[PDB]
Ligand binder design. Sequence first.
Ligand SMILES: [Mg+2]
Ligand SMILES: [Mg+2]
Ligand SMILES: [Mg+2]
Ligand SMILES: [Mg+2]
Ligand SMILES: [Mg+2]
Ligand SMILES: [Mg+2]
Ligand SMILES: [Mg+2]
Ligand SMILES: [Mg+2]
Ligand SMILES: [Mg+2]
Ligand SMILES: [Mg+2]
Ligand SMILES: [Mg+2]
Ligand SMILES: [Mg+2]
Ligand SMILES: [Mg+2]
Ligand SMILES: [Mg+2]
Lengths: 83, 115, 154, 100, 100, 127, 211
Amino acid sequence: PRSLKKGPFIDLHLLKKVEKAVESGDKKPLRTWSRRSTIFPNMIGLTIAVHNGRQHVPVFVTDEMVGHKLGEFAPTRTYRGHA
Amino acid sequence: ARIAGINIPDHKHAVIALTSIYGVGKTRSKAILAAAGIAEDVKISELSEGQIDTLRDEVAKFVVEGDLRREISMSIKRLMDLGCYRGLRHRRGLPVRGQRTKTNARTRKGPRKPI
Amino acid sequence: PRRRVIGQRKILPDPKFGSELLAKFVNILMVDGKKSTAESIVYSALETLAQRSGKSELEAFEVALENVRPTVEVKSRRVGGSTYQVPVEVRPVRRNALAMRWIVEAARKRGDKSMALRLANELSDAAENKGTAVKKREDVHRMAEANKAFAHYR
Amino acid sequence: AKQSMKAREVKRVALADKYFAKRAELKAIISDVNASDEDRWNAVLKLQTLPRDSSPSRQRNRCRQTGRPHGFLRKFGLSRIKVREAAMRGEIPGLKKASW
Amino acid sequence: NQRIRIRLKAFDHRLIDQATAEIVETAKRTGAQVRGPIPLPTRKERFTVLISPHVNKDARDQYEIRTHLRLVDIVEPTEKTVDALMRLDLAAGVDVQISL
Amino acid sequence: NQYYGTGRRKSSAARVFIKPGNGKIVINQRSLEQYFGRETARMVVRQPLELVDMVEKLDLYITVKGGGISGQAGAIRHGITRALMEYDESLRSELRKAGFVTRDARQVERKKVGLRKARRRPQFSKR
Amino acid sequence: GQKVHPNGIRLGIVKPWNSTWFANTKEFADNLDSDFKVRQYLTKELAKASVSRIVIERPAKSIRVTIHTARPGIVIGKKGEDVEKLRKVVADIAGVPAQINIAEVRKPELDAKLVADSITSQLERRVMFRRAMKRAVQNAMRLGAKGIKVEVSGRLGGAEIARTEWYREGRVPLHTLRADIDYNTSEAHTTYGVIGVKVWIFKGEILGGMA
RNA sequence: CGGUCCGGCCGGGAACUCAAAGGAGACUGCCAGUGAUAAACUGGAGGAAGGUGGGGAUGACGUCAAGUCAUCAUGGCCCUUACGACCAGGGCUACACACGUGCUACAAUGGCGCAUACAAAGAGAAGCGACCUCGCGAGAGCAAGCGGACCUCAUAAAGUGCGUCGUAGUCCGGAUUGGAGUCUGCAACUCGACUCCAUGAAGUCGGAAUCGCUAGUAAUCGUGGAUCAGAAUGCCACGGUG
RNA sequence: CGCGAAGAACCUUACCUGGUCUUGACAUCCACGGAAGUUUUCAGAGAUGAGAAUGUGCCUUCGGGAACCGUGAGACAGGUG
Ligand SMILES: [Mg+2]
Ligand SMILES: [Mg+2]
Ligand SMILES: [Mg+2]
Ligand SMILES: [Mg+2]
Ligand SMILES: [Mg+2]
Ligand SMILES: [Mg+2]
Ligand SMILES: [Mg+2]
Ligand SMILES: [Mg+2]
Ligand SMILES: [Mg+2]
Ligand SMILES: [Mg+2]
Ligand SMILES: [Mg+2]
Ligand SMILES: [Mg+2]
Ligand SMILES: [Mg+2]
Ligand SMILES: [Mg+2]
C-alpha cells in the first residue's frame, strides 16, 4: 500500500472534476482514464466511467468503495472460458 | 483445557497448545503466557485450575475462533458482492495477489482437470 | 578409467580410535559434507555398542563387518550375444566397502528415533547375524550360487 | 533503436535536467515530517502536474552508439555488442580478455 | 612541517612503475627524503558479456580492468620539492592525486 | 630463540613460533582446545608433534588468519612442520615420508560460464 | 568455427591499445564516447588520405590524437593548413584543447587496414576480387612479410549465392600469442550488397613481450 | 622490546602475514629397469610442486542455405496525410491444459530458543551510508566517515555447547487467503519488493523414464556483483565444510 | 524452452483501444520574421490549443554574422516493415 505519511493519491484533473460535479449536483457520468486514483468519500454518490483499456465502464460509487483504486472496478482482460 | 469454547488444547507445552485456537499463533501465544504469568514450557496437564482461567481471560482479549471466522467471511464476502478486481478473483477461485495463472496456481485451482 | 591411471587417495585415521577403517565408515554415513555430524553419530553408536555387547569398540565393530562382508558377487558379463551373471570373487577392499555401505543403508531404513540408535541397533544385529544388512548379503551369496554354473564358463 | 526512440531519450534528459530542482524541493516537502497537511497535499498535487518525462526514472539507459535498450554496461555506456567490438579493436583502455 | 601523499593510479603496471620511479628520482634531485614506493592492492574490475547478437547464452567473453595503485610519501616537504612536482607532468595513461 | 614457519592451506596463512617449552599451544591468544572444538582439526594441529618425540618438549605460539576450521588447522600443521625442520634439519626425512612438508595446493575451482558450479552442468534434455 | 579477434587476444601481450588514458567511472563512458566521435569524424574526413589507425591519448586536460597515415602530405596540408582545421574541430568535439600528430607508415603494403581498405576500394570500383586478393598477397610477400592471409566474403562477383574465398602465403600463426599479427577488417558497399574483407599480416615473433 | 586506558591501543620495529613489482623453480634434468645403441614408458630420489602439477583463455579446413535484416550495417522489395510521429489508458503478467529449467520441502544427519567460532571475493558520490534515538519489525529521523588495504555495505552460514520437541501431517512444511503497514517511484488496481499479526494447502521421498559429476570435484552452506528508482529462486562470480 | 531480456507498474514498448500530427519526433539546404531563455492562468486524459508578464544578449562589421524559435515551399525525412 502507499505510505500513510504521503497521504492518498488522486489525480488533479479528476479532483477538479469531482468537486465541481458535487457542488453543482451534476449527475452525468464523469469519463476518466485515471485508474490509479483512490476513491475519496466525496464521490460516494457519483457515477465515474473508468477506461478498462478500450471502453469507459460505468461504476456507481458506494460507501463500501472508499479507499480502493478506481481501476479495481474496471476489468481489463476479457476471459469467458477456455472451451 | 477448554479455552476459547470448543477448542481443547492437548498435554503438549502450553505455548504450543494455545496455537490450536483459531486466531492464536506463536507470537500471540507467547503474549498470552507472558501477560498471564505462566511459563511457556509448562504442560497443560501440569497446569493448575487457577492458571487456566487466567489464560481464558487473556485469550478473550483477542478476536479468535468463531468471531474470526465471521470476520474473515465478511471480508471475503464484501469483496465478492462489491465486485472489484479482488472480488472476481475470489468468485472464480483464482490467485487474488497477482500470482501467475499460466502455470502453478494449483493451491487456488485444486488438482489438474483434463481438457 | 579407459587408461587405468588412478592410484589411491590417502584417508586420515579416525581421531578417537586411530582407525583408517572406521574413518572410511564415517565418510559413507556423511551427507552434505557434514563430517562432524557423522563422527558424533558414529562415536555415540559405537559407545552404545561397546557398553551393550562388552568388549571394546574396534573389535565389536570388526565382528559386525565380518558378518556382513560378502565373498562372491554376481557380475553381468557378455560372452557372444548372450550375457551371464558370472559369480566373481571380491577384493578385500571391495568387501569392506560393500559391508559398510549395506550397514549404513539398512540402518537408514529403520523406524528408531536417532540415526545413532538406528546405527547401533543395526550394527548389534549384524553381530548377531540378523538384520537387513546380513539378509541382503545372504541374498547376494544365494544369487551367486544359482550362477555357479557360469563360473569360468561361456 | 529507431530515430524516434533515441529522440525520446534526449527529451527525457532535457526535461529531467530542467525540472530537477523543482521536483527535489517538492519531494523534500513531502518527506518533511514536520510539514503541515495542506502543504504536503499541495506538494503531492504539484508534483503530479509536473511533466512525467521530468522524472529521472522514466529514462532507459541505451547504447551511446546504437541505442540498444538491453545488455547495457554503465561503465562503458555501450551495449554488450558494441563493448566487445571496441574492446577487441583496442579502443577501451585497460580492457582485455580476462582469465583466472 | 607537514607531509604529502602521492597517489598514482594507472591501467598499465609498466607505465605506473616508470612514473613512480620518475617521481622518486625527482624528489632526490630536489633533496627530499621519500618513503619508498608502496604497492597498494590492484583493483580488478571484471565484465561478462554475451558475444552473439541473438540467443546463444553460455557464449560469453570475460574482460578485466586492472587498476594498479602506488603510493609515495615525501616526508621532507622542501619548498623546492612541492613546486617541482606542480610543474612536473606524467604520462597520459597515469592519474596523479596530490594530498597535503 | 624463536623458530618460525609459514603454513598455508586453502585460503589460510598460519605464522608459528617455536621455543623449547612444557607443551603450551596457543592460537590467536587462545588455547588449542578453545580455538578448535573439532577433534579432527585438533588432531591435525598436533600431528607433527607426536610423530616426532617432541610432544611436550616445545612451546607453540600460532597466529592464523583466513580460511575455515580445517583450512586453518592444515595451515598450522604445515607451519609447525616447516618450523621444526628449520629448528632441526634432521627431521626432513621423517617429515617427508609422512607427507607434512608438501603444501596442499588444492584450491576452490572457479565457477565456469554455462555451469552452475565449477563442474556441475545444468540438466540436459534432448527433447 | 569462429575465431577470436587477433588484435584483442594479443592486447597487452604484443599489441598496444589505440586509446591510452585513465578515467574514473564518472568520466570513462564520456571519454570513450568522445573518442568514438573524434575517430568517426577523422576517418570520414580522411577517407582518401589512407589512414591506418587513430591513437587518442588523453593527457589530463587535453586530447593528443596521433594519426597513422601512409600519405602524410595530403593530411598535414600546405603549411599545416589542413591539420590546423582538423585540430580545431577535434578540440571542439572533445571539449579540451587538442594536439594532433601525424605518424607516417613506411610500408603501406604491410599494414592490414591499408590492404583491406585498398581491396574494398577496388571491389567498389568493380575490380575482380581474385585479382585484388592475389595482388595484395604478392605485394606483402615482396615487402618482406612473414605471412599474409586475405579473406573476402559475400556475393563475390555479384553472385546470387554468397561465398568465402581466401589466399594465404607464408605463416599466419593465429594461435601463437607472441606473433606480431596485424589484423584489420573493412567492408565494400557494392551495388549487389556488402562484401567483407579481412586481412591478417604476420610480421614475426616478438621475443621479450612489450619491450 | 618499553608502557598501558589492556585494544596494534601509544612509542617503536621492518622480523612475519600480506600487498605488488622484479626474479628463481621443473627440464624425464638425475638414478635404475624396459625398449629396436631410438622415441618413449615404468619405478626411485631430491623437491613446495613430476612428467601436460591444478584451472582458464586459445576453437584448423569445413558442416548444418544453423541463428540473428528486432544491436548495427546492408542489396532488393514495400508504406510515405502512413507501415512515419505524439499522447493517455490497457496489454506483454490472460489460464480447461501440456512441457522445459529451477526453488522449497516432504524432517530428527532435523525444527525451534539461547550463547559462541572460522572466510573469500566484491561494490560505492543524484552513491555506500556508520554511530545514537524511535518502531514488534520492514523502516524512519539525525548525522560521522569514505571516490576507498583507511569509511560503509557487513552479523558469514553450515559449525560448536546447552535445552526442548520424540516420529506426529507434527514445534515438519510454508503454499494460500484476511487484516495492518513500510519503502522506491508522478503513480504500486490490473502488475513491485519487503514487514507484522492471523491463516496453516499440497507434500510422509515421487510411474514409465531421465540428468549431472573422477577431487577440493559432487553434495551441501553462506557471501558478493552486474542489470537496476524499485523489482532474483535467474545469471555471473566468491569462499566454508567436504 | 531462467534463450535475445545484465532485471515489462509508467518508461522500456516494438502490441492494442481511443484522441491527435503531416517536410514531420530525428537531419541538412532556402526564404520570411523573430535573441535564446524565464515566471505564471485556462481547457483537456495527455498530446496539444489558447493567453499573458518578463527577458533583447554574443562578436566585430556597422548592409552584418553566429546560436536557437516559429512559419512556408520542396529536395527529403522516417519504418523494431
Ligand atoms: Mg536506424
Ligand atoms: Mg528503468
Ligand atoms: Mg562452493
Ligand atoms: Mg571462441
Ligand atoms: Mg594452444
Ligand atoms: Mg534457414
Ligand atoms: Mg528463423
Ligand atoms: Mg504508453
Ligand atoms: Mg514475457
Ligand atoms: Mg497429506
Ligand atoms: Mg515451521
Ligand atoms: Mg573428466
Ligand atoms: Mg533495482
Ligand atoms: Mg541456462
